[PDB]
Design a protein around this ligand. Structure first.
Ligand SMILES: O=C(O)[C@H](O)Cc1ccc(O)c(O)c1
Length: 309
């Protein structure tokens, strides 16, 4: 037996996972690698003619476009019903294999957890002027802004963006350079995806940055996801589902958190010490329909209007 996977996830991440799945299941996985968003475009072009059985992406916006297009199979309840609601389609059209959340990183030399305000909205204050770094070209930042729009509307969101721009940010290419800049003393705070700082702490246990959450439910704690789904057009849904269940298995989940530095979606995983307990993330996370992150173009418009792009 074989299935076809369209992977928005990189081969160096995916390959060991699919190889162990193949070894255990006897099912071969033929993978087309690509950009998360561009593979969702391809799937919409292929429609019912797609050869794909499984789609695995690393941004909820693209998955949402597939869900809205009617291209995803409803998963068995046995796959999704036990997962936290931040990690599943309500109607069972996809599940998170791992959590890719927004956090706030801070200098351990020049700041502390006490400096972190209740809301991401509070970073426009003078207390933070010139002390934070933004990466407005980062996909994680952008989907976070889309989530802020969904939760709070454009006017609040644009006001925040402008106030953040008026607060003298330093502008960086990506999360790695933002975190390095904390180490280097250029900035004391950065809005980042959760899985970069683990990489620094693994290469150097005493890297002088930690990361943490805003208050419970704040949009700054958004949990994006590396979502996986079965195509409605698949004629091999049992095999596709076995693949998904493999990725939710303890060995795969432990790998995602220890090696990839993303949050697990299940209990019983030894936590990455940089991330801490899954229970804390569940308390921190905002309630957001991730399928609503599909509106990237509206977000890029607001960022252009704020002068951040
Ligand atoms: O494929 C990748 O680049 C990474 O696994 C995921 C990633 C991390 C941080 C980002 O800002 C991003 O856009 C993607």
């Amino acid at each position: 037996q074989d299935i076809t996977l369209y992977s928005g996830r990189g081969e160096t991440l995916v390959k060991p996972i699919i190889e162990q799945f193949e070894k255990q299941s006897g099912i071969k996985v033929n993978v087309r690698y690509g950009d998360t968003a561009q593979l969702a475009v391809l799937l919409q072009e292929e429609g019912a003619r797609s050869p794909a059985d499984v789609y695995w992406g690393q941004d909820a916006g693209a998955m949402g476009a597939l869900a809205n297009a009617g291209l995803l199979a409803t998963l068995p309840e046995a796959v999704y019903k036990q997962l936290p609601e931040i990690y599943t389609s309500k109607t069972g059209q996809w599940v998170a294999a791992s959590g890719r959340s927004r956090v706030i990183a801070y200098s351990t030399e020049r700041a502390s957890a006490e400096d972190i305000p209740a809301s991401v909205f509070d970073l426009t204050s003078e207390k933070y002027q010139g002390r934070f770094g933004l990466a407005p070209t980062n996909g994680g930042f952008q989907s976070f802004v889309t989530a802020m729009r969904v939760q709070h509307g454009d006017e609040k969101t644009l006001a925040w963006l402008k106030a953040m721009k008026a607060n003298q940010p330093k502008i960086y290419r990506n999360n790695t350079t933002q975190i390095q800049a904390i180490g280097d003393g250029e900035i004391d705070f950065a809005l980042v995806n959760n899985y970069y700082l683990p990489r620094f702490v693994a290469a150097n246990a005493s890297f002088p940055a930690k990361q943490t959450y805003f208050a419970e439910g704040d949009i700054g704690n958004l949990v994006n996801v590396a979502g996986v789904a079965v195509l409605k057009s698949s004629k091999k849904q049992p095999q596709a589902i076995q693949f998904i269940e493999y990725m939710l298995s303890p060995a795969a989940q432990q790998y995602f958190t220890s090696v990839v530095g993303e949050y697990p979606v299940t209990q019983g995983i030894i936590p990455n010490p940089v991330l801490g307990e899954l229970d804390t993330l569940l308390q921190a996370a905002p309630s957001i329909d991730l399928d609503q992150l599909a509106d990237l173009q509206g977000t890029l418009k607001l960022l252009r209007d704020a002068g951040l792009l």
